[PDB]
Design an enzyme around this catalytic site. Structure first.
Site, PDB file in Angstrom:
ATOM      1  N   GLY A   1       0.849  -1.220   0.000  1.00 45.31           N
ATOM      2  CA  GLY A   1       0.000   0.000   0.000  1.00 45.31           C
ATOM      3  C   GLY A   1       0.874   1.257   0.000  1.00 45.31           C
ATOM      4  O   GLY A   1       2.043   1.239   0.413  1.00 45.31           O
TER       5      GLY A   1
ATOM      6  N   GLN B   1       2.747   9.905   1.653  1.00 48.64           N
ATOM      7  CA  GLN B   1       4.028   9.239   1.781  1.00 48.64           C
ATOM      8  C   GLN B   1       4.999   9.679   0.687  1.00 48.64           C
ATOM      9  O   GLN B   1       6.229   9.448   0.817  1.00 48.64           O
ATOM     10  CB  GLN B   1       3.898   7.722   1.675  1.00 48.64           C
ATOM     11  CG  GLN B   1       3.234   7.174   2.919  1.00 48.64           C
ATOM     12  CD  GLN B   1       3.152   5.674   2.891  1.00 48.64           C
ATOM     13  OE1 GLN B   1       2.202   5.088   2.366  1.00 48.64           O
ATOM     14  NE2 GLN B   1       4.155   5.039   3.489  1.00 48.64           N
TER      15      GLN B   1
ATOM     16  N   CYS C   1       5.557  -0.511   7.545  1.00 47.39           N
ATOM     17  CA  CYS C   1       5.283   0.634   6.709  1.00 47.39           C
ATOM     18  C   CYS C   1       6.596   1.020   6.104  1.00 47.39           C
ATOM     19  O   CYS C   1       7.573   1.066   6.817  1.00 47.39           O
ATOM     20  CB  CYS C   1       4.791   1.770   7.599  1.00 47.39           C
ATOM     21  SG  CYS C   1       4.160   3.258   6.805  1.00 47.39           S
ATOM     22  N   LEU C   2       6.559   1.428   4.832  1.00 47.79           N
ATOM     23  CA  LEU C   2       7.727   1.859   4.081  1.00 47.79           C
ATOM     24  C   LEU C   2       8.378   3.157   4.636  1.00 47.79           C
ATOM     25  O   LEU C   2       9.585   3.387   4.495  1.00 47.79           O
ATOM     26  CB  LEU C   2       7.263   2.028   2.625  1.00 47.79           C
ATOM     27  CG  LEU C   2       6.706   0.722   1.984  1.00 47.79           C
ATOM     28  CD1 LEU C   2       5.868   0.999   0.726  1.00 47.79           C
ATOM     29  CD2 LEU C   2       7.853  -0.206   1.629  1.00 47.79           C
TER      30      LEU C   2
ATOM     31  N   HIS D   1      -4.974   1.119   7.733  1.00 45.57           N
ATOM     32  CA  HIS D   1      -3.605   1.575   7.761  1.00 45.57           C
ATOM     33  C   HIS D   1      -3.377   2.632   6.719  1.00 45.57           C
ATOM     34  O   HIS D   1      -2.862   3.667   7.083  1.00 45.57           O
ATOM     35  CB  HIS D   1      -2.689   0.372   7.632  1.00 45.57           C
ATOM     36  CG  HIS D   1      -1.243   0.700   7.527  1.00 45.57           C
ATOM     37  ND1 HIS D   1      -0.319   0.307   8.482  1.00 45.57           N
ATOM     38  CD2 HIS D   1      -0.543   1.337   6.558  1.00 45.57           C
ATOM     39  CE1 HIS D   1       0.867   0.739   8.131  1.00 45.57           C
ATOM     40  NE2 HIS D   1       0.765   1.363   6.970  1.00 45.57           N
ATOM     41  N   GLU D   2      -3.764   2.396   5.459  1.00 48.14           N
ATOM     42  CA  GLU D   2      -3.624   3.443   4.435  1.00 48.14           C
ATOM     43  C   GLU D   2      -4.392   4.687   4.731  1.00 48.14           C
ATOM     44  O   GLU D   2      -3.880   5.783   4.563  1.00 48.14           O
ATOM     45  CB  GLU D   2      -3.966   2.917   3.030  1.00 48.14           C
ATOM     46  CG  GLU D   2      -3.009   1.827   2.619  1.00 48.14           C
ATOM     47  CD  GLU D   2      -1.535   2.177   2.679  1.00 48.14           C
ATOM     48  OE1 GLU D   2      -1.107   3.308   2.314  1.00 48.14           O
ATOM     49  OE2 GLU D   2      -0.786   1.309   3.100  1.00 48.14           O
TER      50      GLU D   2
ATOM     51  N   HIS E   1      -2.780   7.267   7.077  1.00 48.06           N
ATOM     52  CA  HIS E   1      -1.822   8.242   6.518  1.00 48.06           C
ATOM     53  C   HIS E   1      -2.527   9.526   6.157  1.00 48.06           C
ATOM     54  O   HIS E   1      -1.908  10.639   6.144  1.00 48.06           O
ATOM     55  CB  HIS E   1      -1.179   7.746   5.267  1.00 48.06           C
ATOM     56  CG  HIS E   1      -0.130   6.740   5.530  1.00 48.06           C
ATOM     57  ND1 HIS E   1       1.056   7.048   6.164  1.00 48.06           N
ATOM     58  CD2 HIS E   1      -0.081   5.426   5.239  1.00 48.06           C
ATOM     59  CE1 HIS E   1       1.765   5.935   6.286  1.00 48.06           C
ATOM     60  NE2 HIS E   1       1.082   4.943   5.756  1.00 48.06           N
TER      61      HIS E   1
HETATM   62 NI    NI Z   1       2.314   2.915   6.048  1.00 44.72          NI
END
Ligand code: NI
Length: 159
Positions: free
Chosen positions: A47, A52, A91-92, A133-134, A137
């Protein structure tokens, strides 16, 4: 390809603005989406949210227990009941760490696709977790801010 921002960047902490109506259907939006899928695919992610990559828009992409490739704009989540479930997240933007987070087990999510057509899905488990989760953000929430059991927050290499 865009740079993924890391935890600490003030751009991750902002409430994102809605995708405005004049962008729906547009080539500008399509290019943002293509740039996001390239970025997510290049680092192996499941995702990615537009903040981000420093774009201040309510736009997330996700897909992969399989999850349909989805591009979701201006989302609204409605928990379907009170049941919570624990799972591992990463998470990235938080490289090298994992934590256990309690999320709604069942949610309805609604929003728009890139052409401005409505999305309305009710989902459970991992799909439900990904969407939560997405969408977090988009309101400036990273998964450490949702952790309740700190015994399960740690370095990937160690946990
Ligand atoms: Ni994330």
């Amino acid at each position: 390809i865009r740079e993924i921002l890391k935890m600490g960047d003030e751009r991750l902490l902002r409430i994102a603005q809605p995708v405005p109506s004049e962008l729906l259907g547009s080539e500008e939006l399509q290019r943002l989406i293509d740039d996001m899928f390239e970025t997510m695919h290049h680092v192996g992610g499941v995702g990615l949210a537009a903040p981000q990559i420093g774009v201040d828009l309510q736009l997330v992409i996700f897909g992969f227990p399989a999850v349909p490739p989805t591009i979701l704009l201006n989302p609204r989540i409605t928990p379907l009941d009170d049941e919570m479930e624990e799972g591992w997240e990463g998470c990235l933007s938080v490289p090298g760490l994992r934590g256990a987070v309690s999320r709604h087990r069942r949610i309805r999510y609604q929003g728009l696709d890139p052409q401005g057509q409505p999305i309305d899905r009710s989902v459970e488990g991992f799909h439900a977790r990904v969407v939560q989760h997405e969408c977090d953000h988009l309101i400036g929430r990273l998964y450490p801010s949702r952790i309740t059991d700190f015994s399960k927050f740690g370095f990937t290499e160690v946990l």
